[PDB]
Design a protein around this ligand. Sequence first.
Ligand SMILES: OC[C@H]1O[C@H](O[C@H]2[C@H](O)[C@@H](O)[C@@H](O)O[C@@H]2CO)[C@H](O)[C@@H](O)[C@@H]1O
Ligand SMILES: OC[C@H]1O[C@H](O[C@H]2[C@H](O)[C@@H](O)[C@@H](O)O[C@@H]2CO)[C@H](O)[C@@H](O)[C@@H]1O
Ligand SMILES: [Ca+2]
Ligand SMILES: [Ca+2]
Lengths: 588, 588
Amino acid sequence: GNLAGIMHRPDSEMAYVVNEQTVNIRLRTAKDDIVSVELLAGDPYSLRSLPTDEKFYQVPKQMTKIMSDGISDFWQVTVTEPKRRLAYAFLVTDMLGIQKIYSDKGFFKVADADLMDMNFYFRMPFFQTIDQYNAPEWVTDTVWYQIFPERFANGDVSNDPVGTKPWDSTDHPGREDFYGGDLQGILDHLDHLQELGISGIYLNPIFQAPSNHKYDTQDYMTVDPHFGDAKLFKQLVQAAHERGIRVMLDAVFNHIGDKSVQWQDVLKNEQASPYADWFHIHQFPATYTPTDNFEFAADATYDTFDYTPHMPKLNTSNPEVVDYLLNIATYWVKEFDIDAWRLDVANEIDHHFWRKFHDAMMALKPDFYILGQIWHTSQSWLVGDEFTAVMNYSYTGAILQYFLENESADALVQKMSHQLMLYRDATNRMMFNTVDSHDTPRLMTLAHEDKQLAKSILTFTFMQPGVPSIYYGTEYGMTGENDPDDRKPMVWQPELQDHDLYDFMQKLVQVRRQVIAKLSDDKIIFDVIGERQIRLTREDNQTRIVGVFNNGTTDLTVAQPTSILLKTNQSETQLAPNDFMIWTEPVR
Amino acid sequence: GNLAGIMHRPDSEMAYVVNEQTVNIRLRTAKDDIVSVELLAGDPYSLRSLPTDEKFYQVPKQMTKIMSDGISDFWQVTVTEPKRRLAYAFLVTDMLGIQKIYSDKGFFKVADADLMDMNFYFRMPFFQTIDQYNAPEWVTDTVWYQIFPERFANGDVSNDPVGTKPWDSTDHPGREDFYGGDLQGILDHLDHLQELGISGIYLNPIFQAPSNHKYDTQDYMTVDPHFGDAKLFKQLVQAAHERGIRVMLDAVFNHIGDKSVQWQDVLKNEQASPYADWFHIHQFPATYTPTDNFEFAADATYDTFDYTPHMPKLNTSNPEVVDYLLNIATYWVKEFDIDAWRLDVANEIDHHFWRKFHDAMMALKPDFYILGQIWHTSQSWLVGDEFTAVMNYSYTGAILQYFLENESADALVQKMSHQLMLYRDATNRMMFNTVDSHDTPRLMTLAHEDKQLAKSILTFTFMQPGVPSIYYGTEYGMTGENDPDDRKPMVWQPELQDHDLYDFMQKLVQVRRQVIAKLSDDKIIFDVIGERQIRLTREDNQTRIVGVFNNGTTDLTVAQPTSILLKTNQSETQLAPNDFMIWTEPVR
Ligand SMILES: OC[C@H]1O[C@H](O[C@H]2[C@H](O)[C@@H](O)[C@@H](O)O[C@@H]2CO)[C@H](O)[C@@H](O)[C@@H]1O
Ligand SMILES: OC[C@H]1O[C@H](O[C@H]2[C@H](O)[C@@H](O)[C@@H](O)O[C@@H]2CO)[C@H](O)[C@@H](O)[C@@H]1O
Ligand SMILES: [Ca+2]
Ligand SMILES: [Ca+2]
């Protein structure tokens, strides 16, 4: 009877509209403290307005315990109501059999609860589809491929930066190196991406900027000339779309580069610049004391990304900045037909701006995908009026920690369960899962070149609800420590490529696209079956996909599956340490 | 170590911006389970970017336990950060001395926590004043007076409805009666309101509509002709403002009356009406089966307020309806200079609309007050982008229950504490407290004509953080059961007025306006000092206001205060049953 562990927050991920007449409701309780939960629910006005003797509270609805995070249990139910108005309360029974009703007014014995008073209950006052979260269906069928354009392929030596180094995937790049990768190189290798099976390309920034990473934007309205031009970008988008590949660009709106027209005008004109209030300048002249690290100053007189004086923060509260950034966001969509924006440092820009951004994008393309780069929990951006999803760093980070270290399977399952219970169910299917990127060490380096372990991490991640992404070169086993070492030139020489891993990744992508993505409204189940042994199940009403992962130090025997989809051991029943086996079976 | 009872929700009432460099942070724990909480907080980027050996987590900030609701304890701290970016985590110690760190990643031993990783922490990513909640300062100095215009004063017999009854405050009105109250009558009695000390008038609907209550609107752009005309309403607003009285009107936007041009066009033209999609019509023709209750139909083919066929619900998702309602909302503000809108059935209209409404009102009048009529918890409307406040029905309902029944003082204090902890501190000071209205029984009836009890309820309510309101006639002791009996004609005959209660209400209003409202950033303390004995304290750094309420069945003795403000017993030390005493003292 741990009443302090019970919570329902109305109008949240715990109470939300799925369609015009249907809502999903959740309740949190302390782990294993509550044995059953029923929902009392119906139209608030029905209690006293309708002449019938029936009352909605006389027909409870059972809730189901769907997940546990080791601290709390989470219960869920779907409710349909034709009047589109809902009052509800929870009947909770603890392990000793003590039942209470829990409502907007607190905890009561049922005999003492004011069940005829609509105001006793929690409320979903009218079911508003305009306020609901919507997931674009095309994302569910996508496997993404992330390209850092300076390092994917050089298709044109004539646009190379001064000082471009010979293309060599065995180099350890410096922070300021150039290798000459560009948009023609991407166009040249679309066949490779189609053969791998990917159906979306995520590019890091491509707009004019002085650096190799291009997060210090000089002009958002121009493709960087070392990458290409507008005609070539249009050609790339149309060629991608012809092959069934969607395109996501990186919007760097939190900060601008110090070589932009706007910041240079501040440096010339100080507070007489018309752009002074496009920034966060505390003292004029806008200045800083240089250090031996180009990306660090201790005392800049203006807010920046991190402490780098080269990335002054934009004032997105200023209506001129809003209009400028919305016009950029609209231009690339309208003129080039991109399918998605990935929003850099999205958490540091205000919600007012992101609501205007969402409204503008959805007015152009109702199926647009808006992905925020946020490393921490992101509930306030994922209500339905701002982003579609965020990068799911905490979820994939938990997976990596489990496979690479020695924690219990229980610990991993608790972390993943906690993550899913932060968000609406449809949101969880839009979250973007990548195990590495241009800002972390490469998978094969984290795995200490253990390819079996890398395959297990990828497969476990590709079974999760979110949408997977492959960082360029993962499919050939590329290594690298953190930035800049995670930005090696792509390995194009066959003698240096891991052909077995490439073949495996094609098979894994196929399972994702042809089997997992094609279940109908599936659910996920996590079972800990032994010391560091996990069974993952995804199932709808016809079909169940099951994956067993043996990450202990002993052999594990399973029943021989009839229809094996993917496995690492030659045996159909035995999993040695770090093996896995994925199979499909009819639901009986 | 009830970890299931510990919760922090980032970006919520538990973590919000107060000003450009300052945030307030709260933590929930299980009642009396956690002995101390410290906050570890600072700029996320400082941990790894700054060359200093100092780290923000080495200087914790103590949190204070501010409230308890009987189930949970609530802790709070204010943090200032010049970089305007905050990462934070909680150090929680239980009664056995077990300490854990609690962060966005869960619960850890301090030795196991990844304190150098900014992503370990909860985040306030940048302090956005554009997203913050703002309270208009003028509301803090207000005492409101609610007028139901058909029943306050008849200043013009010539505009009376057909069948208007003689003015008689001893009648028991029927649902369809008219007594002829109008705007000239309000204008005629502004002296009474000024002498009482009120500084805001809240009117129920005044726009053209067939009924005596005018919630079934016929034309939102016209003062009802039985009430007045535009010139007379302007004269009333200017006369109120000249006396320092602000004006709030009632916006009935959830539903329209069936005699409106728009609904009549639906009845004439069916789905060929241009207004068909201004409503929620499930089947044409739009119809219902009449019953013996004018306000009830079981089978209307369109959504309505409650089950009344005369109030078809408006489709506020439709952009034409949005534009129509925003133009109404703007017209009364721009042309007549009203100070506030009270939003009828506000919970049943979508958040998308209320955000546009908020933006439009604040662009006209940055200090505008937007008050939602919502009976249940209202967190999602009180973030800072929709309403300023709601009617505080749950808070005043808890006060009434305590004074009128026999529950413990503990129960009342727990309920009030729960309410305050739902919302930001500034929001709590904008919540609108009325003990009765045109939809509930009158105070003097609930109190069974016990005037001492009525005075105690009013005084206790006027000491609370929210803004108080007096329903017309309360100051003379008017009685009435629920609607329509709570809408008696106002008592203007001195022989029928309670002159002692009027004198008391003047004194109570004076304490509110001259003492309580003029504390500087006060705090509230609730102390249960005995069986049904409560001490309320409000204090800033110079001054403390204390009120003791004896609602048991025994006498209570207190120390003689030096400066008594208001009391009911003749003694300066003794409180008999249902007495109270309010005093002021310097803070030592
Ligand atoms: O010069 C600072 C920093 O800028 C870029 O970092 C990006 C990062 O890659 C993004 O994923 C995100 O976190 O925002 C940062 C700022 O835009 C460079 O990629 C990085 O090498 C460099 O240190
Ligand atoms: O005819 C239905 C009903 O309409 C009005 O009720 C208002 C109520 O007074 C408001 O405070 C709020 O709850 O919305 C209702 C619908 O607008 C009348 O005041 C009431 O007499 C009548 O029964
Ligand atoms: Ca090139
Ligand atoms: Ca009249």
